[PDB]
Every structure is written in C-alpha cells, then in structure tokens.
Write a protein that binds this ligand. Structure first.
Ligand code: A1IZ6
Length: 290
C-alpha cells in the first residue's frame, strides 16, 4: 500500500523527495515558460507549510526564476510526527539535498534562498554551510533572537525537560493575532487545515533554542548577499536580532528595511506593508539576476 501524506494522499500522486532519514517531503515548483535566470528555494517557518508562499512564489516566477520549496519534516504534507525534529540541522540537511538535486536538473544557474521566521534561521544556516555557493538570501523576520520574554519563559520549561523525562510537556500556542495586523490574513491562517495549531512541544522549542545558538555562531562567518526585512513591532523574532545580523554578518552586500509598526509576518501584513515587501524583494532579486 502506497506511502501517503498525513492527509492520506499517496506521494505517488504528488511532487516529492525522500530525505536522508527515509521520510517523504512534499515539494512545490513554480517554473517560468522560458529559460530560468536563477533558482530560488523558499523555506517556510514553524507550524506552517510551503503553500503559504503561493503569491510570493508566483511573483518570483514572473521574474523568470525557477522557484522551489518543500514542507519541512513534521510540517504540512511531508511525513514526520508533527512539529518534532531529531535535531534542527535536519531541516538544513534537507534543504541542501533539494538544492543539490535541483542544481543537477538545472546546472549552471545561481541559487537564492528565501526564508521567514524559523525558515529564515534555516536559510542562514544553509548559506553558512556552503560559503560562497549561494547568490543571495532574502530574509523575512528571520529567527535570530527570540522575543526576550518568550526566550526566558521557555528556557525555564526547557530546564524541566532537559533535567527530567517529560516527553509531552508543551508551551501554549502562539496567538496568531499578535503576529499580523491584517485581521483577514489572521483569519485565513487560522482556517488552513495544514497549519499546526497546538503549542510547541518543549523538545521542539529546545531545537529552536539550538537554532538561535547556531545562528549566533554562524553570523561572523556569513558572507552571502542578503536582504533583511523586519517589522519594528515583531512579538516573535525580536527586531534586535535583525540589527545584530546587520552588524555581525561579514557579507559585503547586506541591506535592512524596517517596517515601522509592522508585526511579524510581513508578507501577510497590512496591504501597504505586504505590497512593499513584494516590491522590494522584486527589486533586490532583479538587480542580482540581471
Ligand atoms: O516560524 C515561525 C515560528 C513559530 C513559532 C515559534 N516559536 C519560536 C520560539 C520559541 C521559543 C524560543 N525561540 C523561538 O520561534 C517560532 C517561530 N512562524 C512562521 C509561521 N507563522 C505564521 N504566523 C502567522 C500569523 C498570522 C497570519 C499569518 C501567519 C503566517 O503566515 N505564518 C508563525 C510564526
């Protein structure tokens, strides 16, 4: 009997990739009609999935880039216990596998990364693992420093799991209403059956603590060009992390745009913010693929 997604769809009916642990990852592709100018991988964040990026991917494909993505392990239509990961580097390893596979099918093309929130930390660590190989990185509120209160409060819960055997202990779920001012986008996110609504298991949040620690160590070695978009009112990825990334990365091509008053999910924010986000990513990628 065929391997099926967590939603019961046979993987034989869907674009897919099997990772190093034998787990099926659901894949998405948006390819132009002409010859692509570059490849770009879209890295989604915790609890969500690659389908959230449909509009942004179609914009990028309109610039004649070949856009590709997968649902990370434990997310969306990929396999794995929901919101569990043996080690955060699994996400990075799996991105590199997909990138490597695509560079075979479309050799000679520059490859970019785009990531949001946890997906932005994945993008950072992916670039850091292959210095000099990626053409650029677009970061939308990447997880660099967590909100100090959410980091401390959770690090307490972590000390419990780290010292005892408590496999089901979890934090409370994050309130999606504090992550975008656009109420319609909040309602859409809360209506998507592929989104994981439960609170973070402490074991997973420990891996997000690991992500931040590894990002910190990676910064003074990071050289990839990047565009960094950050809201000033981000309740999840503290804006101080965006400033620290601008200060500590060694990249010769780094740009920060701050959206004053905007919340965490900038590509799902008020229309004036989201329209600007799309425009600025368009300009940045266009200038680096011309
Ligand atoms: O990746 C994360 C994310 C999640 C939970 C985390 N907990 C920590 C954490 C904990 C302790 C210590 N250090 C870090 O880091 C996190 C990162 N994301 C991206 C996808 N998200 C999203 N939210 C929306 C809300 C409204 C409307 C649209 C959307 C939308 O499209 N996506 C939610 C946030």
């Amino acid at each position: 009997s065929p391997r099926r997604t967590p939603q019961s769809i046979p993987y034989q009916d869907l674009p897919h990739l099997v990772n190093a642990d034998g787990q099926y990852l659901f894949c998405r592709y948006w390819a132009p009609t002409g010859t692509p100018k570059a490849l770009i991988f879209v890295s989604h964040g915790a609890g969500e999935h690659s389908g959230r990026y449909e509009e942004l991917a179609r914009m990028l494909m309109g610039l004649d880039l070949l856009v590709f993505a997968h649902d990370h392990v434990g997310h969306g239509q990929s396999e794995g216990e929901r919101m569990v990961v043996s080690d955060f580097h699994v996400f990075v390893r799996d991105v590199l596998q997909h990138v490597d596979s695509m560079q075979k099918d479309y050799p000679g093309l520059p490859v970019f990364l785009l990531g949001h929130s946890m997906g932005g930390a994945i993008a950072i660590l992916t670039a850091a693992e292959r210095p000099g190989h990626f053409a650029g990185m677009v970061l939308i509120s990447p997880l660099v420093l967590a909100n100090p209160e959410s980091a401390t409060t959770f690090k307490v819960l972590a000390a419990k799991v780290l010292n005892s055997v408590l496999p089901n202990l979890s934090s409370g779920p994050i309130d999606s209403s504090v992550l975008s001012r656009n109420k319609t986008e909040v309602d859409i996110y809360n209506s998507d059956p592929l989104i994981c609504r439960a609170g973070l298991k402490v074991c997973f949040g420990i891996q997000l603590l690991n992500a931040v620690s590894r990002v910190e160590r990676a910064l003074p070695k990071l050289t990839v060009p990047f565009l960094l978009l950050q809201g000033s009112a981000d309740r999840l990825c503290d804006s101080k992390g965006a400033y620290l990334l601008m200060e500590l990365a060694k990249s010769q091509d780094k740009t920060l745009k701050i959206y004053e008053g905007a919340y965490h999910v900038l590509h799902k924010e008020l229309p004036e913010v989201t329209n600007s986000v799309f425009h600025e990513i368009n300009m940045w990628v266009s200038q680096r693929t011309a």
